[PDB]
Amino acid sequence: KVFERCELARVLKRLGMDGYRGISLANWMCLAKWESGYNTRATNYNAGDRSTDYGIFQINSRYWCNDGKTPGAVNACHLSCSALLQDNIADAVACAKRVVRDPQGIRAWVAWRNRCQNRDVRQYVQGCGV
Ligand code: NA
């Protein structure tokens, strides 16, 4: 599923992402925008280390979910990576919350640092009624 901007913003607020571990809703929107373009079925294989990024938040199989083919991987979210490819993003949101519970927080995703950090991210939630 490819979410429309405000549709996703309202869904994320309802799932309690606004201010989770100090991360504003607009930051989550910026992250989803640059990681997958709000697309839940997005997959990206990383040839360099044999891991794959899954879903709307492009969650990596080395640390967060299990796909069985990633070497030396763990499954901190305790989910099959398949769960991160559904149209319903409840599991993807629960796992994203798990990721930011680690010290790096939102910095765990390099795209956030490059495209969102220190930027005016208001545009991502403007006019969505959230
Ligand atoms: Na894994």
Curated annotation (Swiss-Prot):
- Annotated catalytic residues: E35, D53
Tell where it localizes.
Answer: Secreted
- What GO terms are given for molecular function? identical protein binding; lysozyme activity
**Which UniProt keywords are present, listed alphabetically?**
Amyloid, Amyloidosis, Antimicrobial, Bacteriolytic enzyme, Disease variant, Disulfide bond, Glycosidase, Hydrolase, Secreted, Signal
Reaction catalyzed: Hydrolysis of (1->4)-beta-linkages between N-acetylmuramic acid and N-acetyl-D-glucosamine residues in a peptidoglycan and between N-acetyl-D-glucosamine residues in chitodextrins
Illness the protein is tied to: Amyloidosis, hereditary systemic 5: A form of hereditary systemic amyloidosis, a disorder characterized by amyloid deposition in multiple tissues resulting in a wide clinical spectrum. AMYLD5 primarily affects the viscera, and the predominant clinical features are renal dysfunction of varying severity, and intra-abdominal bleeding. Inheritance is autosomal dominant.
Enzyme Commission code: 3.2.1.17
Q: Which gene encodes it?
A: LYZ
Give an example GO cellular component term for this record.
extracellular region
Entry protein name: Lysozyme C
What biological-process terms (Gene Ontology) are attached? antimicrobial humoral response; defense response to bacterium; defense response to Gram-negative bacterium; defense response to Gram-positive bacterium; inflammatory response; killing of cells of another organism
Source organism? Homo sapiens
> Which cysteines bridge via disulfide bonds?
C6-C128, C30-C116, C65-C81, C77-C95
